[PDB]
Amino acid sequence: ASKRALVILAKGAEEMETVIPVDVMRRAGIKVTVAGLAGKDPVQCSRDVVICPDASLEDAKKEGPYDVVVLPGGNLGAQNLSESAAVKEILKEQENRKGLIAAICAGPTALLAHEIGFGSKVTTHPLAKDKMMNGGHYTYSENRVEKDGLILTSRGPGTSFEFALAIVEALNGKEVAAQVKAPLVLK
Amino acid sequence: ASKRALVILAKGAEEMETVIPVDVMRRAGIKVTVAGLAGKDPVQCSRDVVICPDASLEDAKKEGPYDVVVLPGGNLGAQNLSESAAVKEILKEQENRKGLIAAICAGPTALLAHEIGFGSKVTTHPLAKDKMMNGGHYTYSENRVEKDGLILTSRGPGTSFEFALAIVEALNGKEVAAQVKAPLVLKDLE
């Protein structure tokens, strides 16, 4: 069957960090569900792009399991993910069942907030490093994409293609990632 | 006063080629209007991301002028742009007032369709090259972003950041473009 991705879309999400992985994963044949943290209502992103989610998180939760749960960044987006009990429940479940969790830019700070993946090697945006490392619950990495077991992290809007392709590779293999990447006209 | 950008959003637009330039231009302090070709309703893009436009094109066309008009790609998106008389009028008026026109991926084939900027060095997505240069109305460039006068073109989702930063440099200067670039964590120069 198709692999499945859940992308949790909160108010203030960075729209490039949301759209690049959704689009790239769908190019790979992954069934992606863009789930509104606050319900099915359109979501205002960090630079005011308004994206209409496929479903509420509430509804998407009862439609899994997902091969990957993806947390976009955005200062406000990440704060909102970090404050949600529903997100906590979803990530705890994914981690417990040995499913992939992928977070980009400020997104990984929601992993910290929800006590997810402690002991893992992670990266973040350089501006998020200090918040992420508060408590020494992770080992920090400067890699543009970092994968430590089932915790996959990345640094910024400009690493979003790399992040998304790393997810495709994890789920579908190198050859699929290659087929997807070719037409993207990446450097 | 701030510069203004009109981004014309059609059903089937490539959502990365739409969102990257909107976001990057807004980072630069450009006032960007995402204008829906069909009206004010949300627009389904090529990989099913649904974007709510700020305004209809019919409306935004009345809030001119714009410092840049931006045509995203996407096969179906570019086809809808190519088939619109409203888009033709906008592009004709922009070229006539010596304003920038910026088109990415299959988006430049809309310039061909509307007879815009013939004689320009342009680039497109590799799979759009043949259609763009049928009739010999342009010179082709393999550069990831090309700028020939007021015709600025680029190749694909993977060149969207460079495309958007070129628009920023053309409108707001190299200093602002470098300011906007710094926090993106794009690749270094080496």
Swiss-Prot record, chain A:
Cofactor annotation remark: Deglycase activity does not require glutathione as a cofactor, however, glycated glutathione constitutes a PARK7 substrate.
Consequence when changing residue 129 to R: Partially compensates for loss of stability
Pfam families attached to this UniProt entry: DJ-1_PfpI
Disulphides: none
Location in chain, cross-link Glycyl lysine isopeptide (Lys-Gly) (interchain with G-Cter in SUMO): 129
Outcome of substituting residue 178 to T: No effect on detoxification activity on methylglyocal-adducted CoA
List of residues that carry Cysteine sulfinic acid (-SO2H): 105
Database matches in InterPro entries: Class_I_gatase-like, DJ-1, DJ-1/PfpI, Prot/Nucl_acid_deglycase
Entry-annotated residues carrying N6-succinyllysine: 181
Residues with the Phosphotyrosine modification: 66
Result, substituting residue 105 to A: Abolishes enzymatic activity. Abolishes oxidation, association with mitochondria and protease activity. No effect on chaperone activity. Reduces binding to OTUD7B. Removes the glycations and restores histone 3
Gene Ontology MF terms in the entry: cadherin binding; copper ion binding; cupric ion binding; cuprous ion binding; cytokine binding; DNA-binding transcription factor binding; enzyme activator activity; enzyme binding
Family: Belongs to the peptidase C56 family.
Name listed for the protein in its UniProt record: Parkinson disease protein 7
Taxon lineage: Eukaryota, Metazoa, Chordata, Craniata, Vertebrata
